[PDB]
Design a protein around this ligand. Structure first.
Ligand SMILES: CN(C)C(=O)c1cn[nH]c1
Length: 119
């Protein structure tokens, strides 16, 4: 029932994601010189260094907000990909599966702790 535990749990999951080779295209903002039309397709860029920075600055109130930004990294890749078989999109699906498998308990424990707090 620790209401603050999610933060270190998210920091550790971000460390795992950064050690994963599949995260490389998503570690920093998409380079507009490499993908000139990126902002014509994507309205809200997102990347793992921005998520880590937001977390470390104390600018996420809950793991749900962090989860929303991580899911936006994956939906941006899906929207930008020219093919469902592209290399970078294929990496995003594996990384998404790994992130969802690990964030599930973080979200569950946080919501349970918050419900206990207002019991
Ligand atoms: C990060 N990035 C450039 C992408 O998500 C992408 C998706 N398909 N091709 C490139």
């Amino acid at each position: 029932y620790d209401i603050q535990a999610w933060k270190k749990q998210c920091e550790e999951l971000l460390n795992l994601i950064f050690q994963c080779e599949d995260s490389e295209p998503f570690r920093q903002p998409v380079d507009l010189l490499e993908y000139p039309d990126y902002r014509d397709i994507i309205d809200t860029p997102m990347d793992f260094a921005t998520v880590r920075e937001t977390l470390e600055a104390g600018n996420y109130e809950s793991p749900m907000e962090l989860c929303k930004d991580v899911r936006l990294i994956f939906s941006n890749s899906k929207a930008y990909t020219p093919s469902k078989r592209s290399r970078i999109y294929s990496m995003s699906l594996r990384l998404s599966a790994f992130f969802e498998e690990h964030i599930s308990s973080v979200l569950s424990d946080y919501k349970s702790a918050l419900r206990f707090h207002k019991r």
